[PDB]
């Protein structure tokens, strides 16, 4: 299996992601998105693209990306500080169940995987999530995929932020 | 007029704030919240307080505070990186109108004002906002209140983030 052959699941309407806030990552590829909270935001009233935004929040640092849909269930992210583009797909989504929400998303460079973000608001207890992670591990460079919350900073009275 | 005598307006249900996302600050007191976007977030499913969260996002930096209601329309914020407490009130709110949302919130130390955050998603065009700002300027230390967007960094394809 190669990264280009992973499932490209249908992307739920944006409100279903927003209603899942806040999410935390369970599995990631690089160190960048360890101990990270994901927040989805509807488009600004003054946005001329009317693109929603994904926020990756790690302590007091934040990366933001406006995004739009592209072909074959792609999400085309525009990183807000640089204008750099990223093309993402969803391996699966399972939003707004009786046990909350989960999904796994990935970024390829051809046959190899270069980033992975499995998110949930149920502490990784959706059986689909571990299952999907094990499949993503089988594509080239998937060996880097690892648990995202092994050594996170202590909290100071909040639950999704530190 | 002193800070303790400013109106303490009723705080709208949290969903009305979340539905107003994203907001930007129009007027602030210190430099800290210049060029800042505000995002409200519902409580995490795993939060034991079930407190919602306010996010103050300035470029790639973020401050987060879980908050709960207190007496006399207070909001009691817990800054998520330190556990430091802040007590806030709303001068007014005007959420989810045909011209969008605005509010002005403030933080006193006794008779003086020590922080001010007027937010909107309509670029400060609610007449109540400039009006409220002019009242807040009249309390001790209100002279520091100023326009929040005079010299913000250039954007790179997004609208509420840079
Ligand atoms: C994939 O990797 C190649 C080789 O480093 C690079 O030239 C290309 O820009 C990468 N693809 C994308 C979409 O950035
Ligand atoms: C979340 O899951 C991990 C095990 O994967 C565990 O260490 C942790 O205690 C769990 N948190 C809660 C609140 O149950
Ligand atoms: C208000 O200022 C006084 C004097 O500096 C200080 O002792 C006090 O802690 C401040 N109030 C709050 C609520 O922090
Ligand atoms: C927002 O308001 C300021 C004037 O206070 C103005 O400089 C700016 O052009 C306005 N933005 C838009 C998009 O109209």
From TrEMBL, chains A, B:
GO molecular function, one term: lyase activity
Disulphide linkage map: 3-108, 35-152, 80-158, 104-118
Keyword Glycosyltransferase: no
Name of the protein in question: Hydroxynitrile lyase
InterPro entries the UniProt entry points to: Ricin_B-like_lectins
This protein's encoding gene: ChuaHNL
Source superkingdom: Eukaryota
UniProt-annotated glycosylation sites, renumbered to this chain: 109, 123
Alphabetical keyword list: Lyase, Signal
Presence of keyword Lyase: yes
Naturally occurring in which organism (per UniProt): Chamberlinius hualienensis
């Amino acid at each position: 299996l190669t990264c280009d052959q992973l499932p490209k699941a249908a992307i739920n309407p944006i409100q279903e992601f927003i209603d899942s806030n806040p999410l935390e990552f369970e599995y990631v590829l690089t160190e960048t998105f360890e101990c990270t909270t994901r927040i989805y935001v509807q488009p600004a009233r003054w946005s001329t693209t009317k693109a929603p935004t994904a926020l990756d929040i790690k302590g007091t640092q934040i990366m933001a990306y406006d995004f739009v849909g592209g072909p074959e269930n792609s999400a085309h992210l525009n990183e807000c500080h640089t204008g750099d583009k990223q093309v993402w797909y969803f391996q699966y989504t399972n939003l707004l169940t009786d046990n909350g929400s989960s999904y796994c998303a990935y970024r390829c460079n051809g046959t190899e995987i270069i980033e992975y973000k499995c998110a949930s608001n149920n502490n990784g207890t959706d059986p689909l999530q571990h299952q999907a992670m094990e499949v993503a591990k089988t594509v080239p460079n998937g060996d880097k995929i690892h648990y995202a919350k092994s050594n996170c900073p202590e909290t100071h009275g909040c639950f999704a932020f530190y």
